[PDB]
Design a protein around this ligand. Structure first.
Ligand SMILES: CCCCCCCCCCCCCCCCCC(=O)OC[C@H](COP(=O)([O-])OCC(O)COP(=O)([O-])OC[C@@H](COC(=O)CCCCCCCCCCCCCCCCC)OC(=O)CCCCCCCCCCCCCCCCC)OC(=O)CCCCCCCCCCCCCCCCC
Ligand SMILES: CCCCCCCCCCCCCCCCCC(=O)OC[C@H](COP(=O)([O-])OCC[N+](C)(C)C)OC(=O)CCCCCCCCCCCCCCCCC
Ligand SMILES: CCCCCCCCCCCCCCCCCC(=O)OC[C@H](COP(=O)([O-])OCC[N+](C)(C)C)OC(=O)CCCCCCCCCCCCCCCCC
Ligand SMILES: CCCCCCCCCCCCCCCCCC(=O)OC[C@H](COP(=O)(O)OCCN)OC(=O)CCCCCCCCCCCCCCCCC
Ligand SMILES: CCCCCCCCCCCCCCCCCC(=O)OC[C@H](COP(=O)(O)OCCN)OC(=O)CCCCCCCCCCCCCCCCC
Ligand code: HEM
Ligand code: HEM
Lengths: 53, 380, 445, 60, 74, 102
């Protein structure tokens, strides 16, 4: 990111890739919460919290 | 018709060790990585002959080590050969890394990254192997290193309990450390094969940093007999170290059995960890010290992005040569400080050495390369 | 003098309808030469696999004599005035056109009238162009692009009247006779499926008077009282591969289903093709071509040529690419081509959208240079859209295309679709259908 | 009004990122519901034999 | 892949070598070694040695300061 | 202080050490993509001279020797032959990069 990414085409490419990156970060967040079985997120759910997990 | 270029098992040996084109001018430092492989092989062999009598239970670990050294035929030779071979392995590893830094060999980025992964693996292997004889300093160094690894907030305590298998270092920790110390060198060997493959994709580097395609020789018999001579020399230092002075690089306090009630007045790991331990004593913060350790290993992987010169090697860059030898001098200073008591004046000396270390690797070397480019009428 | 009033200064196409239903359209220009043609909405899609080569064999017989000018005599009066006579037939259109001077307009209207009305057919001529079309098909078997496009139409429109070619199989041209040709003429040569187009130095009043004098009687009654319809064709995701390793080069065409003639999104798809472009080995540009596919193909020496296409039919069509290359490159070329398609579905920026818009503007205006492409545009536009679209309307339709709707239309038509693949030559490294089907979507997106 | 697999594909399965998102969401819903059903079935096979069926005469 | 025969394009270069059985293994060893060892030492000693000299100085200073710290303060 | 800088430049050129191997300054450049394109555009006589100089330097480094002092590359005869080709390559690459920005 020295000088060649300082351009409008690259900014509009990054703006195009914001929702895909955000959806993949959401996928990683939900997968991390489900896999590590975090209590601090799964206590505010309607259905999963009955097992306390 | 010949089996060297046709047989698929012998084809890889032919294109990796026999007919591999190599630069004609690489010095003796290019021996060292090959030496490392032999060292690894030697360690594995001696490790196997240590695994045939070692019992990994806390009541019968030190006693099994004494049974190796006292009753097994030449078991003292095998054990002290294993320990001094680990030390000579880190000697070869440090010189291999320093040669890669001096001659600009980090431009092979994938080879460098596989190397720093190998460095992390062999450091973990050495730490767990030193835990294995269950001496006083083995148990106390294990306890110190893991309970400072517990410094990550909200994750650290669960992680160190799951690493320990309990509340502290105990029989479960010793058994799992024996299993992990057994399993790691084979992963190291596979990563070394990947290391050699990534090197042989692009060829090797000469000390002048130029293109060596104008003058290249076959690997056999030249570097074959050069590596044989290097192996003989490495065996001379290794057998001198094991057969005359088996304890200049060891610790006497590891010859006592492990006592959880008694803590030693001074706790230190081996010398190849000691400089990092000095950085671990440099910052008076737990998490900051842990990140200081991790970045003190990882800025070597960061250095391929710190090249700001148009000349590769340091053979024609004398200011960066001086600054590099100042860096090696600082590493010797940190190695000395790491085995010292936590008392004045070693605190300010260790802090100055850590500041100089990170300043030289991060800040001063690209500036030196930039001004060398300016003085050679290259930089604008 | 900007582009908008330059496109507004194009003369308006004048369209009138006769009492039988025949369309008559004209484009007055300043040229001393004219192009007059007759377009009939009758092709291989309008055949029921018992007269599958009727249009080709009829256009072979069309210039061989009439009931008023038997033999070669009409040929004399089209070659003593310098006029050039041409005809062609696609899968859904037929055209008979004469280019001549402006002075010979009544004569060329008279020849175009009586060729499509009173064409004389005799059995000696039936067998003569029977063997002639057999030799023509034997010649056309060696053109690999025609073979590949016929394969693509065969495998993309399976079981439908769009799969059968214009020529038809050899058994039909060995078994078609006079009665089926007469039935085809009585069923398809009617006024509501006929456009008389003129371009050049032609006034609409004189052309209308000659069309009223000559083309007044065309027998537009449904004699059999059976409605000829146009059912939709079912697109089939499939593949046909013709392995023959003695051929020096391999032709591969990959295409998905097009939207049709009357869909406006075709315009956007044209811009998409203008982003991908085309390349041939004799191109003078080199590495610095704007299209990334052509640049990587000339950098890696992959393909002999590639070209994109958007063939359109009623409600349907074929939107894809065709490349000829050696065997050893084939899979690599496929990969790069697929990536370009997915780039237009995901990462189309405004710079290449503007470049494709300018390319489409230049190609779509400079294609209509001359009386013949203008006359072809008039005939095909009156047959397909029902009207002649003005060029400023094309400019206004190109102008609204930006990158967001281009990637929307590309994700509609290219992303996660089942394509049709036709291969011919050394096509071993051309992969299975499963790898090409997996290449139509990105896991990263 | 299309079929429910048509709108399910067009809203959930067309993009790979939301495909993986619904795989994760359905995975956590499925693990909760499947553990409920499996412990219900294993409870239904074994009346009077498990410890949780008899921990009231002795717990006090 | 990167074997001999296609490494680089070299034109008009002549190379001469002898058999190892015609030449000595150690031809004029010290008479050409000690001047070269002294020459290499001359080119590199001013860039190698002074960091290790100042390390030795800091090491001796730290040792004597530690011994003075352990000493009594009357 | 121009002559101080110039004499310091001569001292740094003699202290770099590549003149003792017969090398020019342009031989010592690291062969990146731009530098490799600069070698690719060279005339064949300059290419052959450069390749012989690299071969001679590698042969000298193999035996740990240097040239005699009269055969050292002097500062005044050190020709910067690769500078216009490298300049053109950098200009073309920056033009391509600035076109790819917009
Ligand atoms: C000093 C006095 C002798 C002298 O001047 O000799 C000239 C000679 C140098 O003269 P030159 O011709 O200018 O140099 C080219 C050599 O002749 C060409 O030889 P070379 O310099 O390439 O030698 C290869 C290198 C190969 O080195 C290795 O293989 C060592 C690899 C590393 C092993 C581990 C080292 C680190 C351990 C740390 C703990 O050998 C050595 O480093 C020494 C080998 C000694 C073998 C036993 C001799 C009896 O110096 C030596 O050979 C020095 C070593 C012997 C004394
Ligand atoms: C600046 C001042 C530098 C002073 C020192 C250098 C110049 C004076 C050198 C005087 C001669 C020294 C010995 C020369 C020599 O290599 O003799 C052995 C040579 C060759 O003997 P050699 O090479 O077989 O010696 C044995 C070498 N090793 C031990 C490595 C196997 O000549 C004769 O023996 C005759
Ligand atoms: C016994 C009497 C003195 C004998 C030695 C006399 C000199 C002989 C030659 C040796 C020169 C060594 C010079 C000092 C080396 C050095 O790096 O010192 C750093 C030290 C610097 O340490 P410092 O005293 O500034 O420590 C504070 C450090 N900071 C500022 C970072 C918080 O220099 C000195 O102490 C200067 C006085 C000389 C002390 C050495 C006595 C040796 C016995
Ligand atoms: C010890 C030997 C020191 C020595 O002799 O240094 C001088 C030598 C000069 O070699 P060079 O500059 O290539 O020129 C040769 C002639 N033109 O230079 C060399 O031999 C360069 C040696 C490079 C490797 C030195 C490694 C030292 C140990 C470093 C350990 C720590 C590494 C980093 C860890 C984090
Ligand atoms: C064991 C003790 C005795 C050792 C032997 C002593 C020498 C005896 C023999 C001398 C023979 C001399 C022959 C000629 C040698 C020339 C050496 C040379 O190349 O010197 C140049 C070198 C690098 O210069 P440069 O880095 O550009 O300078 C800017 C400052 N950084 O410049 C220098 O090296 C000088 C500056 C060094 C700065 C060191 C700083 C440390 C902190
Ligand atoms: C898979 C191969 C290996 C096996 C089976 C193995 C096995 C052992 C055993 C049983 C011990 C304890 C006996 C003793 O007191 O020395 C030990 C110690 C040790 N090992 Fe290994 N080892 C292996 C590879 C390595 C490697 C590659 C290293 C270097 C990183 C290493 C470094 C050490 C060290 C430093 C000790 C402590 C020496 C001591 O305190 O006596 N080992 N190893
Ligand atoms: C596990 C210990 C290691 C082994 C067994 C090992 C093995 C080897 C071998 C066999 C070679 C080829 C021979 C040679 O060039 O000397 C080599 C080269 C190389 N290694 Fe390692 N290596 C190790 C550690 C490392 C580390 C930690 C690094 C990163 C700093 C590294 C970076 C390199 C580089 C850059 C080269 C190529 C340089 C050149 O050939 O000129 N290696 N290594």
């Amino acid at each position: 990111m020295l000088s060649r990414f300082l351009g409008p085409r690259y900014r509009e490419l990054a703006r195009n890739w914001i929702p895909t990156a955000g959806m993949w970060g959401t996928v990683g967040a939900v997968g991390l919460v489900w896999a590590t079985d975090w209590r601090l997120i799964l206590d505010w759910v309607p259905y999963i919290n009955g097992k306390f997990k | 018709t010949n089996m060297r270029k046709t047989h698929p098992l012998f084809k890889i040996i032919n294109h990796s060790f026999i007919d591999l084109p190599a630069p004609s001018n690489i010095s003796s430092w290019w021996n060292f990585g090959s030496l490392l492989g032999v060292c690894l092989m030697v360690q594995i062999i001696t490790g196997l002959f240590l695994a045939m009598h070692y019992t990994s239970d806390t009541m019968t670990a030190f006693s099994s080590v004494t049974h190796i050294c006292r009753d097994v035929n030449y078991g003292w030779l095998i054990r002290y050969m294993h320990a001094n071979g680990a030390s000579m392995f880190f000697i070869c590893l440090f010189l291999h890394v320093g040669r890669g830094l001096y001659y600009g060999s980090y431009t092979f980025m994938e080879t460098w990254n596989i190397g720093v992964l190998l460095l992390f693996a062999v450091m973990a292997t050495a730490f767990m192997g030193y835990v294995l004889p269950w001496g006083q300093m083995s148990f106390w160094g294990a306890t110190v290193i893991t309970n400072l690894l517990s410094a990550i907030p909200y994750i650290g305590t669960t992680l160190v309990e799951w690493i320990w298998g309990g509340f502290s270092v105990d029989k479960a920790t010793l058994t799992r450390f024996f299993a992990f110390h057994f399993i790691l060198p084979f992963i190291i060997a596979a990563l070394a094969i990947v290391h050699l493959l990534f090197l042989h994709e692009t060829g090797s580097n000469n000390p002048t940093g130029l293109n060596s395609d104008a003058d290249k020789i076959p690997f056999h018999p030249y570097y074959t007999i050069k590596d044989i001579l290097g192996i003989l020399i490495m065996f001379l230092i290794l057998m001198t170290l094991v057969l005359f002075f088996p304890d200049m690089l060891g610790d006497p306090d590891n010859y006592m059995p492990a006592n959880p009630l008694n803590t030693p007045p001074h706790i230190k790991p081996e010398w190849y960890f000691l400089f990092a331990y000095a950085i671990l004593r440099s910052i008076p913060n737990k998490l900051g010290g842990v990140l200081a350790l991790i970045l003190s290993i990882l800025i070597l992987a960061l250095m391929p992005f710190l090249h700001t010169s148009k000349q590769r090697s340091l053979m024609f860059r004398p200011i960066t040569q001086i600054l590099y030898w100042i860096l090696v001098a600082n590493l010797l200073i940190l190695t000395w400080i790491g085995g010292q008591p936590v008392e004045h004046p070693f605190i300010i000396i260790g802090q100055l050495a850590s500041i100089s270390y990170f300043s030289i690797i991060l800040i001063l070397m690209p500036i030196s390369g930039i001004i060398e480019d300016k003085m050679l009428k290259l930089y604008p | 003098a900007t582009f908008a009033q330059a496109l507004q200064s194009v003369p308006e196409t004048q369209v009138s309808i006769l009492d039988n239903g025949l369309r008559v359209a004209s484009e007055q220009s300043s040229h001393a030469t004219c192009t007059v043609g007759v377009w009939i909405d009758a092709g291989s899609r309008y055949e029921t696999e018992k007269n599958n080569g009727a249009g080709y064999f009829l256009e072979h017989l069309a210039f061989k004599g009439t009931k008023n000018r038997p033999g070669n005599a009409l040929e004399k009066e089209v070659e003593s005035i310098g006029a050039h006579l041409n005809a062609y037939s696609t899968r859904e259109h037929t055209a008979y056109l004469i280019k001549a001077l402006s002075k010979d307009l009544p004569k060329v209207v008279e020849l175009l009238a009586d060729i499509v009305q009173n064409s004389s057919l005799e059995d000696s001529q039936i067998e003569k162009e029977r063997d002639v079309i057999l030799r023509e098909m034997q010649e056309n078997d060696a053109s690999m692009q025609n073979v590949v496009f016929d394969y693509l139409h065969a495998t993309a429109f399976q079981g439908t009247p769009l799969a059968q070619a214009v020529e038809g199989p050899s058994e039909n041209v060995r078994r078609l006779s006079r009665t089926d040709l007469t039935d085809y003429l009585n069923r398809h040569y009617k006024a509501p499926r006929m456009v008389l187009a003129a371009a050049g130095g032609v006034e609409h009043q004189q052309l209308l008077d000659l069309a009223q004098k000559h083309l007044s009687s065309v027998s537009r009654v449904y004699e059999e009282d059976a409605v000829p319809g146009l059912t939709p064709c079912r697109f089939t995701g499939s593949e046909i591969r013709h392995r023959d390793d003695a051929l020096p080069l391999a032709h591969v065409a990959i295409a998905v289903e097009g939207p049709g003639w009357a869909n406006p999104d075709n315009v956007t798809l044209q811009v998409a093709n203008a982003i991908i472009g085309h390349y041939d080995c004799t191109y003078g540009g080199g590495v610095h071509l704007s299209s990334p596919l052509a640049s990587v193909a000339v950098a890696n020496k992959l393909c002999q040529s590639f070209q994109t296409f958007n063939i359109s039919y009623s409600d349907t069509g074929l939107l894809g690419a065709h490349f000829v290359c050696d065997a050893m490159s084939i899979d690599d070329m496929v990969f790069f081509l697929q990536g370009q398609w997915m780039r237009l579905c995901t990462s189309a920026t405004e710079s290449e959208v503007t470049r494709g818009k300018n390319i489409l503007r230049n190609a779509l205006v400079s294609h209509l240079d001359g009386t013949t492409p203008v006359c072809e545009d008039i005939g095909r536009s009156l047959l397909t859209y029902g009207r002649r679209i003005p060029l400023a309307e094309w400019e206004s339709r190109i102008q609204e295309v930006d990158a967001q709707m281009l990637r929307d239309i590309c994700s509609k038509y290219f992303y996660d679709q089942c394509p049709a693949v036709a291969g011919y030559g050394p096509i071993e490294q051309l992969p299975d259908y499963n790898r090409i089907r997996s290449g139509m979507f990105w896991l990263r997106f | 009004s299309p079929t429910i697999p048509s709108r399910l594909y067009s809203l959930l399965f067309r993009r790979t990122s939301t495909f993986a998102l619904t795989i994760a969401v359905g995975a956590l819903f499925f693990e909760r519901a499947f553990d409920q059903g499996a412990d219900a079935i294993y409870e239904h096979i074994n009346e009077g034999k498990l410890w949780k069926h008899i921990k009231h005469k002795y717990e006090n | 892949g990167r074997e001999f025969g296609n490494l680089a394009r070299i034109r008009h270069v002549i190379s001469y070598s002898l058999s190892p059985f015609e030449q000595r293994a150690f031809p004029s060893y010290f008479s050409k070694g000690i001047p070269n060892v002294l020459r290499r030492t001359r080119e590199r000693i001013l860039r190698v040695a002074p960091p290790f000299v100042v390390v030795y100085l800091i090491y001796t200073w730290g040792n004597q300061e530690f011994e003075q710290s352990k000493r009594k303060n009357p | 202080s121009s002559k101080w800088l110039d004499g310091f430049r001569k001292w740094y050129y003699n202290a770099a050490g590549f003149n003792k191997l017969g090398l020019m300054r342009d031989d010592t450049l690291h062969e990146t993509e731009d530098v490799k394109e600069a070698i690719r555009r060279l005339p064949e006589d300059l290419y052959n001279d450069r390749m012989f100089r690299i071969k001679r330097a590698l042969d000298l480094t193999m035996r740990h020797q240097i040239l005699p002092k009269d055969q050292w590359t002097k500062y005044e005869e050190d020709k910067f032959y690769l500078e216009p080709y490298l300049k053109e390559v950098i200009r073309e690459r920056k033009e391509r990069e600035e076109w790819a920005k917009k």
